[PDB]
Amino acid sequence: AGADEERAETARLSSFIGAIAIGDLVKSTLGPKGMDKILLSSGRDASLMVTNDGATILKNIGVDNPAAKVLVDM
Amino acid sequence: AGADEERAETARLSSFIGAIAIGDLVKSTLGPKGMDKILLSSGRDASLMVTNDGATILKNIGVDNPAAKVLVDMSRVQDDEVGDGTTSVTVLAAELLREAESLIAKKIHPQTIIAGWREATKAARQALLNSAVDHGSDEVKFRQDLMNIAGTTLSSKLLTHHKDHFTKLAVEAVLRLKGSGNLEAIHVIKKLGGSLADSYLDEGFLLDKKIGVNQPKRIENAKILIANTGMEKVERILKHGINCFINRQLIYNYPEQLFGAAGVMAIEHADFVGVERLALVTGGEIASTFDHPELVKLGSCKLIEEVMIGEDKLIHFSGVALGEACTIVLRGATQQILDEAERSLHDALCVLAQTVKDSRTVYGGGCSEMLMAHAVTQLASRTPGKEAVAMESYAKALRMLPTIIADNAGYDSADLVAQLRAAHSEGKTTAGLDMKEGTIGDMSVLGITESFQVKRQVLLSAAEAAEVILRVDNIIKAAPR
Amino acid sequence: SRVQDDEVGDGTTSVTVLAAELLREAESLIAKKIHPQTIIAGWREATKAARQALLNSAVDHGSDEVKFRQDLM
Amino acid sequence: AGYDSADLVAQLRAAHSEGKTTAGLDMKEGTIGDMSVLGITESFQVKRQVLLSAAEAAEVILRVDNIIKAAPR
């Protein structure tokens, strides 16, 4: 264990996992009772940035190696 | 499995922890005998700062991932547009978070209870008037200006013998504060020389710097020169008639000889903050290279002079044409209390201006808190909805304040709550906690009355912060720093 | 202590010991269980203690001038 | 004195509550005795200054709430 290996069930899984992570944060945002979140990164970021609009925050950061940034661009 | 994983119960915990963390540090500070704390930062900071005033330190830094900075930021307007005295507004906000545990039992969406904050407007209006206390303050006012609330701020402080006189003076300082122009240019320094009054009020801004041993002792029909760049000079100088030069930064030695013979008084390394305030005061100037003299600069010509204040010499720049900015100078023999003036007077500036601006106040010594607690229990029942259930929880939050005021008086807390409530529900607004008695008494005889605004701004800010908080996820707490 | 020495003297050292013992009672102080600062008002009460050290004690009753037996010993 | 302290406390209190200011601790005796016979007296002034001096030393701990620092790192 402890390596990046993908075939069969797992290759499909990386697409699957990227979709689930984004959905939980965005679901709160929609509707009158909608919610806005705060994000903090220390590496050359002034402070916490808060974006209610899902599109603006997704464009801003390419935090991880799994596919999702391309999806965000669209 | 990303990293910061939090459960719905743990997400709220981060907000919960934040209120408790802040309350413990501010807790030492409150009432009669409070204590100073030290705080450290490097890179954007360099050493350890110690601040007696809780509001000043919270404002200056956003130390960590925990969210409370936004809650904290509102307090600055509290300390300018009203409440300061003794810090306690932050502590009450913290208290409301504890009721959230009882809220989990309420199998209802937390977002909906948030609408209770919609109710904050109808609670803030009810909280107000339920307290019912001061009929009015006309403006400036000859006798109602003080001998009131500033004394309470002082009541907490030991210095209340000579000091209460100092507190009274603060009103004169605040009277000039009101009007168009904003909250700008107010500076105060305490000094070593002793007097019964222990304070002198000056019409203009004060500074403490000297050109050198040589140079004229006094100047008149004074003209002021300010430079953004460090040290031709005589030629431009003679025609204007220049009486004083103020420079923010180091000053070159050669011009110093010139000024002495000419009869012009200059200031070496004048602090920038004093200078910026001064510009508003004198009508301002364009500060740049040595061309800066004549028309580009406009100076005020009333009085700049060195005078002796009982002993040690100072410079008193005074009689500003604008009239929007002024300075305060303190005096005293020497003790804990005299340099405690620095602790107290800064507090004095914020309390009084507001007391004159609000024209409304509430009874101190916790009189307001018990009465308000009585009225609010009924109010929850009156309103339809969860709107009623959230409101009922809020009402017992107020109960803790009576306990804290008594606690800092040395007297047994449970006994105190009992006697306190019976007197307030009775219908007498004047009655309140008497710390010196260790029981309940007439607050008015003491002369204690909290500015009305201090009570409404604290309640409204806590309410809005609460709206966002139990409808988010990522945070936590450690302390101010 | 030195100001005291100039104003009267050494005697035998004992003043320092008396001040130290007052700290021991602080353990039971917690037992009162509330605000240590108003405990200080006890000091205010010490003025009462101070008058006690006054007039309800032996004093002289004799030290007329020279004195036959009480000159010393 | 090299004498039993427990015994001493009881007898000392015993002579004083009576109302006889003369009785006191005689170390040479090992028990209690008539101080006046010894001839021992203390100046009035030594008692007032010691009381004032001991009281202020005690307050240095209480008039100032805190003196040092907390957590730089």
The CB density around residue C64, as the number of other CB atoms within 10 Å, is 8
In terms of Cα–Cα distance, which of B301, B291, B300, B297 is closest to B236?
Answer: B291
In terms of Cα–Cα distance, which of A66, C43, A37, B30 is closest to D54?
Answer: C43
Question: Collapsing DSSP states into helix, strand and coil, what is residue B181?
Answer: coil
Separation of alpha carbons B348 and B160, rounded Å: 13
Question: Collapsing DSSP states into helix, strand and coil, what is residue B22?
Answer: helix
C residues 11-50 near B, CB within 8 Å?
34-35, 37-39, 41
Separation of alpha carbons B245 and B258, rounded Å: 12
Burial of B156 (0-12, 13-18, 19+ CB in 10 A): buried
D residues 47-66 near B, CB within 8 Å?
63-66
Cα B89 to its chain centre, rounded Å, is 12
What are C61's two structure tokens?
């009753």
Separation of alpha carbons B229 and B227, rounded Å: 5
Separation of alpha carbons B219 and B306, rounded Å: 9
What are B197's two structure tokens?
């009054």
The distance of B471 to chain A (nearest Cα, Å) reads 7
- Residue from B403, B405, B408, B437 to probe the interface with C (highest C Cβ count within 10 Å): B408
Question: Collapsing DSSP states into helix, strand and coil, what is residue B394?
Answer: helix
Chains D and A touch (3+ CB pairs under 8 A): no
What are B199's two structure tokens?
């304070």
> Which approach determined this entry?
cryo-EM
Kindly list the distances between the CA atom of residue B175 and the CA atoms of B154, B452, C46, in Å, as whole numbers in the listed order. 20, 18, 43
Separation of alpha carbons D55 and B456, rounded Å: 45
Separation of alpha carbons B390 and B463, rounded Å: 12
All chains having 3 or more CB pairs closer than 8 angstroms to chain C: B, D
Is B48 close to D65, i.e. CB distance below 8 A?
Answer: no
Beta bridge partners of A49: A39
The CB density around residue B49, as the number of other CB atoms within 10 Å, is 16
Element containing residue B38 per DSSP (H, E): strand B38-40
Beta bridge partners of A50: A38
Amino acid (one-letter) located at B354: Q
Residue D20 assigned to a binding site = no
Phi and psi at residue B118, to the nearest 5°: -60, -40
In terms of Cα–Cα distance, which of B76, B41, B77 is closest to B61?
Answer: B41
All chains having 3 or more CB pairs closer than 8 angstroms to chain D: B, C
Separation of alpha carbons B441 and B59, rounded Å: 37
The CB density around residue C35, as the number of other CB atoms within 10 Å, is 20
Residue D47 assigned to a binding site = yes
Separation of alpha carbons A51 and A29, rounded Å: 10
Separation of alpha carbons A74 and A59, rounded Å: 10
Reported in sequence order, the residue ranges of B252-317 that DSSP labels E, i.e. its strands, are 265-267, 306-308, 313-315
Q: Would you say the C-alpha torsion B140, B146, B152, B155 has a positive or negative sign? A: positive
* Contact between residue A39 and residue A50 where contact means Cβ atoms under 8 Å apart: yes
Is D38 close to C11, i.e. CB distance below 8 A?
Answer: no
Tally of helices (H runs) and strands (E runs) in chain A = 3, 2
DSSP-derived secondary structure letter, A30: S
The count of C-alpha atoms lying within 13 angstroms of the C-alpha of B23, restricted to the half-sphere facing its C-beta, is: 17
What are B325's two structure tokens?
């900015």
Kindly list the distances between the CA atom of residue B442 and the CA atoms of B215, B363, B476, in Å, as whole numbers in the listed order. 59, 10, 43
Instruction: For domain B134-202+324-359, give the fold.
Output: GROEL; domain 2 (3.30.260)
Is A47 close to B67, i.e. CB distance below 8 A?
Answer: no
Separation of alpha carbons B156 and B141, rounded Å: 25
The structure was resolved to a resolution in Å of 10.5
- HEC readout, chain C: CHHHHHHCCCCCCCHHHHHHHCCCCHHHHHHHCCCHHHHHHHHHHHHHHHHHCCCCCCCCCCCCCCCCCCCCC
Cα D53 to its chain centre, rounded Å, is 13
Separation of alpha carbons B54 and B4, rounded Å: 31
In terms of Cα–Cα distance, which of C33, D48, C29, D73 is closest to B47?
Answer: D73
DSSP-derived secondary structure letter, B115: G
The count of C-alpha atoms lying within 13 angstroms of the C-alpha of B336, restricted to the half-sphere facing its C-beta, is: 13
Cβ contacts of C41 on chain B, cutoff 8 Å: 410
Angle of helix B452-469 relative to helix B118-130, nearest 10 degrees?
160
Separation of alpha carbons B1 and B23, rounded Å: 33
What are B143's two structure tokens?
């006798």
Q: Which sequence spans correspond to the domains of chain B?
A: 1-133+360-481, 134-202+324-359, 203-323
All chains having 3 or more CB pairs closer than 8 angstroms to chain B: A, C, D
Separation of alpha carbons B410 and B436, rounded Å: 9
- Give the dihedral of Cα atoms B76, B23, B122, B389; nearest 10 deg: 160
In terms of Cα–Cα distance, which of A51, A28, A29 is closest to A40?
Answer: A51
Chains A and C touch (3+ CB pairs under 8 A): no
What are B54's two structure tokens?
């809780």
Q: Are strands D23-25 and D32-34 parallel, antiparallel or unpaired?
A: antiparallel
* Contact between residue B328 and residue B188 where contact means Cβ atoms under 8 Å apart: yes
Kindly list the distances between the CA atom of residue B87 and the CA atoms of B34, B239, B464, in Å, as whole numbers in the listed order. 10, 54, 20
In terms of Cα–Cα distance, which of B415, B393, B397 is closest to B458?
Answer: B397
Phi and psi at residue A16, to the nearest 5°: -60, -50
The count of C-alpha atoms lying within 13 angstroms of the C-alpha of B460, restricted to the half-sphere facing its C-beta, is: 16
Separation of alpha carbons B194 and B311, rounded Å: 9
Amino acid (one-letter) located at B426: E
Domain range B1-133+360-481, CATH architecture: Orthogonal Bundle (1.10)
Separation of alpha carbons B154 and B166, rounded Å: 10
Angle at B321 between CA B317 and CA B326, to 5 degrees: 50
Angle of helix B413-426 relative to helix B400-407, nearest 10 degrees?
120
Kindly list the distances between the CA atom of residue B418 and the CA atoms of B52, B138, B406, B413, B421, in Å, as whole numbers in the listed order. 33, 37, 12, 9, 6
Element containing residue B370 per DSSP (H, E): helix B367-382
Question: Collapsing DSSP states into helix, strand and coil, what is residue B225?
Answer: strand
Question: Collapsing DSSP states into helix, strand and coil, what is residue B378?
Answer: helix
Query: The domain B203-323: what is its CATH number?
Result: 3.50.7.10
Q: Are strands B186-190 and B326-330 parallel, antiparallel or unpaired?
A: parallel
* Contact between residue B265 and residue B252 where contact means Cβ atoms under 8 Å apart: no
CB within 8 Å of D10: residues ≥ 6 apart: none
What are C22's two structure tokens?
């007052």
